[PDB]
Design a protein around this nucleic acid. Structure first.
Lengths: 168, 260, 77, 69, 167
RNA sequence: ACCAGGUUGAUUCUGCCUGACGUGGAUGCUAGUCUCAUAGAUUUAGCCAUGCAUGUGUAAGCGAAGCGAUUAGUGAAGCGGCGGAAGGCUCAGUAACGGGCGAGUAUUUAAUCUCUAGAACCGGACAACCUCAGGAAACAGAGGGGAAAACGGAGUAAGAGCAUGUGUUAGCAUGUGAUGAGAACAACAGUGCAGGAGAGUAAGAAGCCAUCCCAUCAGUUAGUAAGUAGGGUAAGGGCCUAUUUAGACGUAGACGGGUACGGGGGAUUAGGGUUUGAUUCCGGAGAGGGAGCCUGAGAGACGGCUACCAGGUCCAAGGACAGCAGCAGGCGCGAAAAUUACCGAAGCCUCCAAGAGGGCGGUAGUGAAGAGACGUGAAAACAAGUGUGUGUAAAAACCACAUGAGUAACUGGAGGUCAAGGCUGGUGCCAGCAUCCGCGGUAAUACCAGCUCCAGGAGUGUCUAUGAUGAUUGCUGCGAUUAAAAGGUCCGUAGUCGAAGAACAGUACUUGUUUGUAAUGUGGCUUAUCGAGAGCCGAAUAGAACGAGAAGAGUUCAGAG
RNA sequence: CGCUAGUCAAGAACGAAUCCGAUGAUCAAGGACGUAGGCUGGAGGAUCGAAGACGAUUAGAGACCGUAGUAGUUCCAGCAGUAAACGAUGCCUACGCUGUUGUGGUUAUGAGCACGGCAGAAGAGAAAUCUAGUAGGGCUUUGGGGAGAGUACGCGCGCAA
RNA sequence: UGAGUGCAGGGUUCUAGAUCUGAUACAAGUCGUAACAAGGCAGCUGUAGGAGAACCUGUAGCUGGAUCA
């Protein structure tokens, strides 16, 4: 049926391709994700930014290039993903940095997720018990609880994250 | 259809009214009256949105049953009465006065004025005719009619009206170097000064304009109202004086020019 | 009289054009009676309906051209 | 019922023929080729049985459910 | 009843067309009014938008204008002499626009006699008026407007129409 | 922007079958929590029990009975006024004024706006009231009063058309004239109604351009093509009729037949494409099938009337009534689709209204059609429960605090394609399995089971249409010596295609400026714990108006051949 | 299309300082020719020989072989419209390596132009081989896994086949 | 202006039918052996006769022939 809402995953063309199976298995294992759908969701997000960079570099006009480059780079800096010293009002560096985006990887999006941040900031003994503190309300940000492990943490929120003891 | 249309679906109503798509299926169908349906707004949208003084239909009723609201000097009692551009709105209790103008985006907006500006409006001249008993007449854009005005006023000019006497006060014509306001098109709500006019036969005349902060733009005469005797404007315009910026210009102005 | 008008239509898939034509029946007045004939080009103006098929009237014409009935030199030169 | 033709259908499972009586109602299904075509080694048969008396034949054969009676 | 729509009509190429609607009132027609000569009888018809139209069934008289001398008179109508569309409307004496009619000439005779040049300007009219012949043409539409009005035939118009009457 | 298995004793090719992946319906087995959408379209535009979906009164049109009164009052039966032509449902018919873009006439328009703008007398009835009183019912009679801003007449303003001057063209002058009216009331301090001229809204008719398959359908048409004159209409017109002229349309597909609600849009997609559109917006048509119609500003109306045909219902047998492609609901038909639920609240529409009405619309209930976010433990310490408050029209859910606690996985597979066992027991070309290739004749990693593994996971298998696979439909981009494939040879019309040199012109061609897109989609930003969601911004297709450039295309010339 | 003379029209190629100036390429519909065998009418009839009849050979031969024998095989006036009608390679127009051998004209005797054969090479192609090399030049015909099937129904031509 | 309904015809789509005649599948039935080797008369295309049946015979053609001589 045709109805509201987008679809956020793309199914792989070959269901039993051995190099894909092994490399996916590793990354789910290491990062403590629920199933293959969590991973595929991040992959589509990553692809979208790569497409924008491609389009910008090949555009003929200057007005669009100067306008939309800035927006793309600023956004990815705020998420804490693309960390480099982009200088504005300088055409060459904008081109240089756009080229550096083109080999961005899903690992970089994964490491901004709250489940990984909690463990990485040494507030939990494993990526597993980090998830188990996001459930059951033990994790709090700016004085308010966050129930969802997929919460992507912007650059500089790290000062305000906290854990509290269990209710028992 | 067997007869005249009564309803109006919310997705079909003018983009100038600026009403939220999701809340309900209908919108108010303006009553017949002074301006066209595409160039005016019903009064009940003004009181609930543009200038918030009611929040429910029971309150909208009460305000007009008590006879509070005055438009062009007459008290109004139809909630679906159309108001248009250059159209003084007032509440005599608390002595408030407003004109109706466009945002730079082309939406409608109310602008607060003094009791001086509240005394006059502007319209455009559409036809001249002589009537039974050899009486000369003249007519205007918003369905206005005038008896024994100055004969020299020509079709296409713009005239200033005294609201208390309902007579014409001043006249201005379409010439190089006069101030213009933009009613319809790509550049609604812009304000500028005439560079040059190119005359066409049996078809609209093309007018070329310079903006106050340098930009040239041209449009057809059918979308322009002339809003001053020569140099400078009659009516007081908005908090921002009708300058429109591209997203590109907004970026340059925010983060600085691209250096060599 | 019957007037033919001709034009080209673009077919997007094959990136090429086809020739098309339409027939229009027009009113010719007695003031043009001897002057307009087959092959000539004509200008017509629009009006309210004159009959079941007729809506245009001939208003003037451009005569199918001759540059010159070419010169013959005198035998004396 | 829908055409008043009489057709041949195949009965899939191990003991499947025992789950059907004369004058039972059955629902019938396609073999999965592009046109209606024979599949495997069965000559000239073009459909297969799916349900008997409103219940799944797979459940009947494997004794997970019983006849409506 | 009667219709003015082109529902039933063929295409210009000769082919038939199919019907896509039942009939609509906004293309209704009405039966002809056949105005006869006789004592006045006129009917009032309620028309679209609530307007009224006046339909003459019988008429006795008309206003008739003299164009050269600029006066108008009111006179009886005798009979139709000629009708351009159909020979039948003449023999049954039915009134329409462009019918040519015989009238009482005496009022016109009394007026035109005052001009001392009258005989010299139009001898054939003068002769007709002596012989008791007086001919006029109807300009109004009786079935629409509810009355008949016209002008007296003079000069070359007489010369033209009299050739249509003669056996 | 991608491949794999299958003709042979092996090999290299042509070629088709099958697998692997989106999406629309149907269905097996299994199912913890919360949020956003959507549901008798496909078959029968089949048939329908019941209840509801359209009515409205003020200080201010007329006011009967009753009640009551020092000649007051009341409180209203009917009449009048305004609406019932919108919205809701469906896709039968239509290859067409059905669809897109421009333009504003040859037209009519209750309400509403601006300017302007009204000295008028007389008479009956109809309904309700009162007295009889019919009929099985549905529905009606006699007789007698009496109102209007209801109705008909009188005068009187006004006044269509026709003719001539003068200003196209209003207007004015003059002659002639059919027709022929008109509302006030209340003071809580206002509300109405007659005439004009211009607007505003809505139709009717028109201009240009685009529109499906069959040649085993090649000729079609005679109101047909045109002219003159008249009738008719709100209005142009063969719209209709009389006499004259023979036209009009076709291989660049006429005419006939079959099929179809049309767009904005949807699905797939590197690009070029291929498929669909009953279905939130716009426009069209219908109300069992056909046809006629009164009233009105507006209907060829069906929750109006009238007749036939097909079907029904009640009767006292004489007659009456009725039409769910509105909302619930029932029966059928099918492989196929929810509650005879609440609603002085939100968005709007209707009236004579500081109020009344609305199944239009909103709120929940039901269902693994679709789309988000999360449970099923951690190493010290875990959903779903419950109670208060909130929330709403009233609710439930959601959220806040406080109490208990310790519950929570299945579907398809394991010989190759294709991820994962020559494990143990039965069966012996049987019973079965297998999209394809192939297994089983007593030593079956392939059947039937046990046990371990694999894949996706609140989900997974199957059937059926379609897009991709596919350069196996080829514009980009395939083939024709031998695999399928160059007409036995010429002539020839329509069709498609056509020198050098010197000049010329602007309709195609390309491009500027201006128009042309609500939703959807596209580039963004901001707020619901997050993410779909919601709100605001910017640019945009095809199509049209006016300019510009002249290479290619086009037209002409001859001290060129 | 193969004996010799005489006669009657038109065509191809070659040589060269002739004339006209875009008159042209390809082709649904429509028209003309088309070995052999066959058919309608006339002439004729040597040789050969379908059908038919015998003799042998064989299990059986109706066939192959031998004897005999008819329609046809020839000519004139027509109908018909098919072939492994094949170099199984459409028609115009291009760009393209060498050696050798022909046929007809012309020649500074060095060579050319038209129509051919042959042998290598380089490229090409699944190979065999090359009318197949290079290529978005123009126009027509035509194929889309085997079978059923070039069959059924309708239609057009023909005396029939 | 016209619903309905008489009587003849057409145009479409389905369906019945004694009997005849195609095709396809027939584990392996009966009679021969026509093709693939010079397949025991080299094969094949057109046309015309004949015949239980494959097929045989005359006439013109082709090599995809058993010969590039």
């Amino acid at each position: 049926v045709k109805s509201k809402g987008i679809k956020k995953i793309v199914v792989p063309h070959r269901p039993f391709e051995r190099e894909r199976l092994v490399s996916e298995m590793y990354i789910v294992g290491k990062y403590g994700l629920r199933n293959k759908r969590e991973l595929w969701t991040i992959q589509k997000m990553c692809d979208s930014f790569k497409l924008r960079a491609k389009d910008l570099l090949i555009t003929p006009d200057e007005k669009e290039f100067t306008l939309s480059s800035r927006r793309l780079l600023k956004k990815l800096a705020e998420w804490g993903v693309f960390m480099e010293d982009v200088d504005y009002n300088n055409k060459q560096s904008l081109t240089n940095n756009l080229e550096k985006l083109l080999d961005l990887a899903p690992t970089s999006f994964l490491e901004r997720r709250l489940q990984h941040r909690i463990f990485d900031l040494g507030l939990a003994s494993s990526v597993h018990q980090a998830r188990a503190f996001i459930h059951a309300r033990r994790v709090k940000i700016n004085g308010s609880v966050v129930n969802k492990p997929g919460y992507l943490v912007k650059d500089g929120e790290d000062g305000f994250i906290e854990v509290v003891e269990s209710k028992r | 259809v067997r007869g005249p249309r009564k309803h109006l679906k919310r997705l079909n109503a003018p983009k100038s009214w600026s009403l939220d798509k999701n809340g309900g299926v209908f919108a108010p169908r303006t009553s017949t009256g002074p301006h066209s349906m595409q160039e005016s707004i019903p009064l009940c949208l003004l009181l609930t949105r543009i200038l918030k003084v009611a929040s429910n239909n029971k309150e909208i009723k009460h305000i007009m049953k008590n006879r509070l609201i005055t438009v062009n000097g007459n008290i109004r009692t139809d909630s679906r009465y159309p108001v248009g551009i250059m159209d003084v709105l007032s509440i005599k209790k608390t002595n408030e006065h407003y004109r109706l103008l466009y945002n730079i985006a082309g939406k409608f907006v109310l602008h607060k004025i003094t009791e001086e500006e509240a005394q006059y409006r502007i319209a455009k001249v559409t036809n001249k005719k002589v009537v039974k008993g050899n009486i000369p007449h003249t007519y205007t854009s918003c369905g206005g009619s005038f008896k024994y005005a100055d004969p020299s006023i020509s079709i296409g000019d713009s005239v200033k009206i005294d609201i208390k006497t309902s007579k014409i006060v001043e006249n201005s014509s379409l010439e190089v170097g006069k101030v213009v306001y933009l009613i319809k098109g790509k550049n609604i709500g812009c304000l500028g000064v005439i560079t040059g006019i190119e005359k066409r036969e049996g078809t609209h005349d093309i007018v070329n304009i310079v903006d106050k902060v340098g930009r040239n733009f041209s449009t057809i005469f059918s979308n322009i109202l002339v809003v001053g005797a020569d140099d400078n404007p009659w009516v007081t315009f908005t908090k921002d004086e009708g300058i429109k910026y591209s997203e590109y210009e907004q970026s340059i102005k925010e983060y600085g020019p691209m250096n060599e | 009289i019957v007037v033919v008008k001709r034009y080209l239509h673009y077919v997007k898939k094959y990136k090429r054009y086809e020739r098309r034509y339409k027939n229009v029946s027009v009113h010719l007045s007695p003031c043009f009676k001897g002057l307009v004939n087959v092959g000539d080009t004509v200008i017509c103006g629009e009006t309210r309906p004159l009959s079941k098929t007729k809506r245009f009237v001939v208003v003037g014409f451009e005569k199918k051209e001759i540059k010159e009935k070419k010169l013959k030199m005198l035998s004396e030169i | 019922v829908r055409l008043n033709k009489k057709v041949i259908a195949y009965v899939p499972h191990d003991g499947g023929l025992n789950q059907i009586e004369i004058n039972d109602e059955v629902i019938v299904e396609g073999l999965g080729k592009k046109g209606c075509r024979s599949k495997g080694d069965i000559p000239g048969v073009r459909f297969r049985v799916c349900k008997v008396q409103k219940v799944s034949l797979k459940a009947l054969v494997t004794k997970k459910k019983e006849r409506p009676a | 009843g009667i219709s003015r729509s082109n529902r039933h009509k063929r295409k210009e190429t000769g082919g038939k067309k199919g019907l896509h609607e039942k009939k609509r009132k906004n293309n209704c027609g009405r039966p002809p009014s056949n105005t006869r000569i006789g004592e006045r009888r006129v009917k009032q018809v309620r028309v679209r938008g609530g307007n009224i139209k006046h339909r003459a069934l019988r008429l006795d008289t008309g206003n008739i204008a003299c164009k050269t001398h600029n006066f108008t008179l009111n006179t009886s109508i005798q009979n139709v002499m000629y009708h351009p569309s159909n020979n039948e409307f003449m023999r049954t004496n039915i009134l329409t626009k462009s019918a040519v009619v015989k009238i009482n000439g005496q009022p016109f005779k009394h007026e035109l006699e005052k001009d001392q040049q009258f005989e010299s300007k139009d001898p054939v009219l003068f002769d007709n008026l002596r012989k008791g012949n007086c001919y006029a043409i109807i300009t109004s539409r009786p079935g629409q407007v509810g009355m008949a009005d016209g002008y007296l035939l003079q000069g070359e118009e007489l010369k033209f129409y009299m050739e249509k009457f003669k056996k």
